[PDB]
Design a protein around this ligand. Structure first.
Ligand code: ZN
Lengths: 49, 98
DNA sequence: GGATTACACCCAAGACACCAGGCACGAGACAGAAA
RNA sequence: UGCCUGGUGUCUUGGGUGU
DNA sequence: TTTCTGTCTCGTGCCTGGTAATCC
């Protein structure tokens, strides 16, 4: 889904379809960020909460 | 005896015309896999010539069909896209001096 | 001097740390030697 | 009672296909 | 020659480092 297709989707005005194509139908990921430093250095352990 | 043997075999196998450790800056594509889809394709492949001007710094003049090409290369047969005009096929009565 | 020169798709083919040389463990054979 | 499997290199290069 | 054996070579093993345009 190259850049020209992205431009066509922008021209159509469909932001939801573009977001879904580039996230859900592709590499979606979840990260944790510190609310102070703003870096992705949070050592998150989901099972221990 | 391994030096010459490996050098020749590598250059013929990969098409890079040079030493193995100098693969960069060597003329690539000299040796190609023979096209055996049909008899005419094999015959055409065995009589093909290449102009190593590349893609960088391209110009229309090398790709054109010149007046002096008459009788020595085919006016009709040339690839499409990047290599158009740069790849030529010998005419059906042409030869190369020895 | 630096930076950049259309988009997408298919297939095939050849290369990818090798090595050599110095250090250790175990073994065994053919020759020593008493009888 | 003898009991069922999803896991697929990379980098180059070449030749092609549709505009 | 019979028998216990030595001890130094040697097979198997391994560590680890050398070695082309144009344009601003
Ligand atoms: Zn923080």
């Amino acid at each position: 889904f190259g850049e020209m297709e992205r431009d066509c989707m922008i021209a159509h005005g469909a932001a939801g379809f573009l977001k879904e194509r580039l996230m859900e139908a592709s590499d979606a990921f979840r990260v944790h960020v510190c609310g102070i430093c703003g870096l992705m250095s949070v050592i998150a352990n989901l099972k221990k909460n | 005896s391994t030096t010459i043997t490996s050098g020749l075999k590598y250059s013929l196998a990969t098409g890079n015309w040079g030493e193995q450790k100098k693969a960069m800056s060597s003329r690539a594509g000299v040796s190609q896999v023979l096209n055996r889809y049909t008899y005419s394709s094999t015959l055409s492949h065995l009589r093909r010539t290449n102009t190593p001007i590349g893609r960088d710094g391209k110009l229309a003049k090398p790709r054109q069909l010149h007046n002096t090409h008459w009788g020595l290369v085919c006016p009709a047969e040339t690839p499409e896209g990047q290599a158009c005009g740069l790849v030529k096929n010998l005419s059906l009565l042409s030869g190369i001096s020895i």
